[PDB]
Amino acid sequence: SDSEVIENVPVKVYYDKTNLYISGIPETVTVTLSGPRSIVQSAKAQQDFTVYADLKNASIGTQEVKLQVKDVSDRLKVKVNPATVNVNVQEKVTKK
Numbered sequence: 563s564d565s566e567v568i569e570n571v572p573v574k575v576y577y578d579k580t581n582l583y584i585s586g587i588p589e590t591v592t593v594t595l596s597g598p599r600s601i602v603q604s605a606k607a608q609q610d611f612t613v614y615a616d617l618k619n620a621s622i623g624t625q626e627v628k629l630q631v632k633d634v635s636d637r638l639k640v641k642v643n644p645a646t647v648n649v650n651v652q653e654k655v656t657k658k
């Protein structure tokens with residue numbers, strides 16, 4: 563078993579980009595990977611996993627969101643720091 567702490571991993575953010583703009587998510591996070599050596603090392607070398615905040619079902623306003631990981635081997639244990647973040651989901655247009 564092997565383990566790597568990877569710094570400065572980008573966070574993708576998914577949402578209705580047509581109507582909304584979302585501020586507050588960090589641009590990067592720290593990801594910890596553990597599992598079989600070959601798989602941990604390939605993930606570190608290629609960094610082909612994806613950390614994301616999915617705000618597709620969010621309503622306008624302030625909230626919190628847990629960060630997810632995809633495109634990652636099923637043989638790895640993964641955690642993200644910070645695990646959850648504050649977000650501000652704003653409408654691109656103003657009604658005031």
Ligand SMILES: [Cl-]
Pocket residue numbers: 585586649650
């Ligand atoms: Cl904000």
